[PDB]
Design a protein around this ligand. Sequence first.
Ligand SMILES: Nc1c2c([n+](CCCCCCCCCC[n+]3c4c(c(N)c5ccccc53)CCC4)c3ccccc13)CCC2
Ligand SMILES: Nc1c2c([n+](CCCCCCCCCC[n+]3c4c(c(N)c5ccccc53)CCC4)c3ccccc13)CCC2
Ligand SMILES: Nc1c2c([n+](CCCCCCCCCC[n+]3c4c(c(N)c5ccccc53)CCC4)c3ccccc13)CCC2
Lengths: 51, 51, 51
Amino acid sequence: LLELDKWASLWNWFDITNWLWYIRIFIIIVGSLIGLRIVFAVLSLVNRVRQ
Amino acid sequence: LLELDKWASLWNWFDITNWLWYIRIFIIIVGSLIGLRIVFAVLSLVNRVRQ
Amino acid sequence: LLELDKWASLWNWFDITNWLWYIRIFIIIVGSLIGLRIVFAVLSLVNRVRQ
Ligand SMILES: Nc1c2c([n+](CCCCCCCCCC[n+]3c4c(c(N)c5ccccc53)CCC4)c3ccccc13)CCC2
Ligand SMILES: Nc1c2c([n+](CCCCCCCCCC[n+]3c4c(c(N)c5ccccc53)CCC4)c3ccccc13)CCC2
Ligand SMILES: Nc1c2c([n+](CCCCCCCCCC[n+]3c4c(c(N)c5ccccc53)CCC4)c3ccccc13)CCC2
């Protein structure tokens, strides 16, 4: 079941341990990833005449 | 608050437990979604033929 | 580790708690945010008709 001992016990093989409480930092990075996309839209204007 | 007894209470309908579990995986799905969106640019090009 | 004492005790300043139960939700908000990006493609070309 869910308990303090279970969280500390998960430290045996490290793989789920790191991914369980360090994903949130990576989460913020995935946000701005959509923001940068907007500059891309100007390329559509050039897509008609091509490079 | 939350504890061993609190989580086990949701084991009968576990409706919310399904959502409160695996959320991390869902974000990963939304990570590849942003790249796929780029292909949509082709949709705009044909707007020149329509009204 | 984790315990109902750590969560409730955290309510003394509630400063980090706000960051612990608001940013998680922000992910879902960022979902629709990426879908909204598509209109930009149309808006990119519309500039040739309107300033
Ligand atoms: N030697 C091993 C063991 C185990 N693994 C499986 C993974 C065990 C670690 C993850 C445990 C996380 C528990 C929390 C997840 N969790 C949460 C919540 C619930 N309501 C949950 C309900 C049921 C289960 C988990 C829940 C609500 C919020 C979270 C191994 C895997 C690889 C190698 C060796 C392993 C299992 C036993 C031995
Ligand atoms: N898979 C994991 C999970 C979890 N954990 C525990 C995460 C706990 C985060 C809070 C730590 C900062 C506390 C700041 C609050 N806090 C405290 C105190 C003060 N005097 C403060 C003063 C000012 C501000 C805050 C203060 C005194 C005592 C606390 C893991 C830990 C390691 C590895 C894997 C983990 C949890 C779920 C999964
Ligand atoms: N017929 C039903 C009954 C009951 N249920 C249970 C109600 C749901 C309880 C969920 C517990 C949430 C606790 C959140 C604690 N928690 C956490 C974190 C924070 N940052 C927090 C900040 C503030 C407060 C709590 C916090 C960060 C991590 C946790 C049902 C549920 C679904 C369907 C039918 C149900 C009960 C009786 C009948």
